[PDB]
């Protein structure tokens, strides 16, 4: 009881009828008492001649005093009283609650506008944490309520606390909760909901210095006090699902589970150290009876594998990861698709996995359900070709791709043809060849040959597709004149006998179709003026042109779409269009000017019995079979011996091509030379 320091303050604080103390005087006195009790040392101090104020600083007349100042100083004085006397704990539970219920009022006022006493309030919250005198609130018959109130004060939106106390607030709420074993679910919501209600990088502005207390606090507790929050996180997730399931509403469980997943997703992006607390639940969700939950669980893990994190998932939670990829055989196709729909992002976000993916995708490309196979081929469409050759490298993958080209399913077949097509084009204008990647090229080089084989199954639809596709990726109409032949050879490089026969056949028809469109216009210009409405060939030519238009419309899926197309063109009778069209079939035409007349021809038909749109998509795919593309000026490029020796895999092609181009009929060939002599 005897020390070196002693309380110097010895003035009345309680105002009675006999002896009263004005507000100001009492305010100043409490100020002195406060400033002194703060300098007093815990150990070396009398403390004996202080009890007088111990029983005075609890008078309800002061705790609920009008003037905020008195209550402020009183709270500061009490904070030190608990400090000094500690651990003796002088005040009883009753008196203690009245004090902790007053301090909360201070924290509440600390958020509101300055009452001219924030300094004292700041000292309160700070000292109450430094001396750990705030934990005393944890061991009370009303700690639960005081806890909920404590959090509501800081997490109160209508409040505005300085970024300076953020670290302090996290300490208060941190130590106070670290004393609880079963924190009210109400408190948990308030703490976790911040990860959902507040999401940064949402509004691209100038500084984003806005910041938020509730959020930062949640992070402090989930980071600094993760060891104690993880235990509660499991309770929260478990309690929520529990509450929503028993809920009279049968359409709430699925709505709440989706949020929890989003919460976990956010937690993993901020504090992936707590995900281990509820990682177990998810694990079983995947193999849960209800597929919906399995679908959501699969989608969740799929989103986590695409979010930035200081920690690794497949490394930390490998048990669940294997369960994730194990959904490639899930009974529910929806779960399968939901899975395959995440691969694109993952592959474009990480390269960590290149084994499980190739093993799963291999089965996904041959799954019974068409939906998944479609979502599988979509990969080569969404994710860039580059990332494709880098990540996936499985043999079955490519093979299965080109395999679906001959599949009965249309929607899948169509998408496939187009995909594996553009893929081939981009697989040559970006990725090169090495001593290791060439192991799979034998599949990408056989693509052009494959497409041409589709002409054998004989199908108006397929044929049209192939035609439009080839001249869209494989053999383009740009950019120069040399590179065309260069690639034209790289395309015909890996070609089987059927590929060539069909290749040449597709050309042998071009000269015939050309002889048609040519006359088509010669018979179309029939109405350029009165000629033989019933004179010359009127009764025969009419049925000549009318029966010739069906010829070029017999190789089209919708013949009734062509006969009406060219028929309306006959109605227009515009010499212009007739010129371009005719100037695109007269054979022997500079590839350059061809692209000019063609491009302008299809563009002039746009936005003019039905929309001309059809006429365009019909005449276009009709010209690819008519107009000469490969059998033109390209002859000179190949005519010029680009090789003096070696590279025999090119000379044989030069032969294969020219040898056939000459077989067309030298009927006109051996004539030019004669006129030249």
Curated annotation (Swiss-Prot):
Q: Which UniProt keywords apply?
A: Acetylation, Cell cycle, Cell division, Mitosis, Nucleus, Phosphoprotein
The protein in question is named Sister chromatid cohesion protein PDS5
The family assignment reads: Belongs to the PDS5 family.
Q: Where in the cell is it found?
A: Nucleus
Per the record's keyword annotation, is Nucleus included, yes or no?
Answer: yes
The reply to whether rRNA-binding figures as a keyword in the UniProt entry is no
Source species, please? Saccharomyces cerevisiae (strain ATCC 204508 / S288c)
Q: Name one GO cellular component term.
A: meiotic recombination initiation complex
Primary residence: nucleus
Task: Write out the ranges of the repeats annotated as HEAT.
Answer: 391-427
Described by its record, this protein's role is as follows:
Essential for the establishment and maintenance of sister chromatid cohesion at centromere proximal and distal regions during S phase. Also required for chromosomal condensation.
UniProt's post-translational modification comment states: Acetylated by ECO1.
Gene Ontology molecular function terms on file:
structural molecule activity
Instruction: Write out the GO biological process terms.
Output: cell division; chromatin looping; DNA repair; double-strand break repair; homologous chromosome pairing at meiosis; meiotic cell cycle; meiotic DNA double-strand break formation; mitotic chromosome condensation
Tell me more from the record. Answer: Present with 7720 molecules/cell in log phase SD medium.
């Amino acid at each position: 009881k005897g020390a070196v320091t002693k309380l110097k303050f010895n003035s009345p604080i309680i105002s009675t009828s006999d002896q009263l103390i004005s507000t100001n005087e009492l305010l100043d006195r409490l100020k002195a008492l406060h400033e002194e009790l703060a300098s007093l040392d815990q150990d070396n101090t009398d403390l004996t001649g202080l009890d007088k104020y111990r029983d005075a600083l609890v008078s309800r007349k002061l705790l609920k005093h009008k003037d905020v100042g008195i209550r402020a100083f009183t709270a500061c004085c009490l904070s030190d009283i608990l400090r000094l006397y500690a651990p003796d704990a002088p005040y009883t539970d009753a008196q203690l609650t009245d004090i902790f219920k007053l301090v909360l009022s201070q924290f509440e006022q600390l958020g509101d506008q300055e009452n001219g006493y924030h300094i004292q309030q700041t000292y309160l919250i700070t000292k109450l944490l430094e001396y750990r005198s705030i934990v005393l609130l944890a061991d009370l018959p009303s700690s639960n309520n005081l806890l909920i109130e404590l959090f509501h004060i800081f997490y109160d939106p209508n409040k505005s606390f300085p970024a300076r106390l953020f670290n302090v607030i996290g300490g208060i709420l941190g130590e106070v909760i670290s004393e609880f074993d079963s924190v009210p679910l109400e408190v948990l919501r308030l703490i976790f909901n911040k990860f959902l209600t507040y999401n940064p990088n949402e509004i691209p502005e100038g500084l984003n210095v806005t910041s938020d207390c509730g959020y930062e606090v949640s992070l402090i507790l989930c980071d600094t006090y993760s060891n104690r929050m993880s235990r509660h996180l499991t309770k929260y997730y478990s309690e929520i699902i529990h509450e929503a399931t028993n809920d009279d509403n049968n359409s709430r469980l699925l709505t709440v589970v989706v949020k929890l997943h989003k919460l976990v997703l956010r937690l993993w992006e901020t504090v992936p150290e707590l995900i281990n607390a509820v990682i177990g639940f998810i694990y079983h969700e995947l193999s849960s009876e209800n597929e919906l939950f399995r679908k959501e669980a699969t989608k969740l893990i799929g989103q986590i594998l695409t979010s930035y994190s200081d920690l690794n998932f497949v490394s930390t939670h490998s048990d669940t990861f294997k369960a994730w990829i194990s959904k490639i055989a899930d009974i529910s196709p929806d779960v399968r698709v939901e899975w395959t729909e995440s691969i694109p992002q993952i592959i474009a976000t990480r390269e960590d996995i290149s084994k499980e993916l190739n093993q799963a995708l291999a089965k996904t490309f041959i799954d019974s359900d068409p939906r998944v196979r479609r979502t599988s081929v979509m990969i080569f469409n969404k994710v860039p070709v580059t990332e494709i050759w880098k990540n996936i490298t499985n043999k079955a993958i490519y093979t299965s791709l080109l395999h679906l080209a001959r599949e009965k399913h249309k929607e899948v077949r169509e998408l496939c043809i187009n995909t594996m097509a553009k893929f081939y084009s981009n697989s040559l204008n970006e990725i090169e060849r090495t001593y290791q990647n060439k192991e799979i090229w034998e599949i990408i080089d056989t693509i052009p040959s494959t497409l041409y084989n589709l002409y054998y199954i004989n199908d108006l639809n397929i044929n049209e597709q192939v035609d439009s596709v080839i001249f869209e990726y494989l053999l383009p109409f740009e950019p120069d004149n040399d590179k065309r032949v260069h690639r034209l050879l790289t395309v015909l490089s890996h070609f089987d006998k059927k590929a060539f026969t069909s290749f040449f056949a597709f050309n042998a028809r071009q000269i015939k179709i050309s002889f048609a469109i040519s006359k088509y216009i010669d018979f179309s210009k029939f109405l350029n003026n009165q000629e033989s409405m019933s004179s010359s060939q009127g009764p025969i030519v009419m049925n000549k042109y009318n029966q010739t238009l069906q010829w070029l419309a017999s190789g089209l899926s919708d013949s009734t779409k062509a006969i009406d197309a060219l028929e309306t063109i006959k109605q227009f009778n515009d010499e212009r269009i007739f010129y371009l069209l005719n100037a695109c079939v007269t054979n022997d035409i500079p590839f350059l000017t061809f692209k000019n007349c063609y491009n302008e021809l299809v563009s002039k038909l746009q936005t003019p019995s039905i929309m001309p749109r059809d006429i365009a998509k019909v005449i276009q795919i009709l010209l690819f079979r008519a107009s000469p593309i490969i059998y033109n000026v390209s002859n000179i490029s190949v005519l010029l011996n680009l090789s003096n020796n070696s590279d025999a895999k090119q000379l044989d092609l030069k032969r294969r091509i020219l040898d056939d181009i000459s077989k067309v009929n030298p009927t006109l060939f051996k004539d030019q030379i004669r006129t030249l002599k």
